[PDB]
Symmetry: C3
Subunit: 51 residues, 3 copies
């Protein structure tokens, strides 16, 4: 009985799923990081003049 | 089984989809949490700079 | 034995969930850190430019 074919479909689907998750989380992460990059750039410029 | 690879395969698709969404929800929760600690630190540095500034005479 | 295929699915999906979370969370930490090291560098500046 083709548990093998069921199990092997699972493996393929899971591993693409994992991929997807990681990339989607990291793009959210990159977005959040850029938020904060743009604040830090605007503060760093402040300090350089307030100097 | 033969063709109830279809029922197994279709259970695989349903479960994988719910899994992908959960992993993403949890990850992004953890991101927001860490972003927030950084936000809080920038807020208080921003306030410092606004005072360490206004002071002149 | 949909049951045996289905229960291999459950075991594999649940392992891939946590894997995707582990990797996301490490990318997040990595970014955090970059940002922390920028903050500490700016903090120190302000504490001296507080001359």
């Amino acid at each position: 009985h083709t548990l093998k074919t069921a199990n092997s479909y699972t493996d393929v689907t899971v591993s693409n799923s994992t991929k997807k998750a990681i990339r989607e989380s990291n793009q959210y992460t990159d977005h959040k990081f850029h938020q904060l990059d743009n604040r830090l750039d605007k503060l760093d410029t402040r300090v350089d003049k307030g100097l």
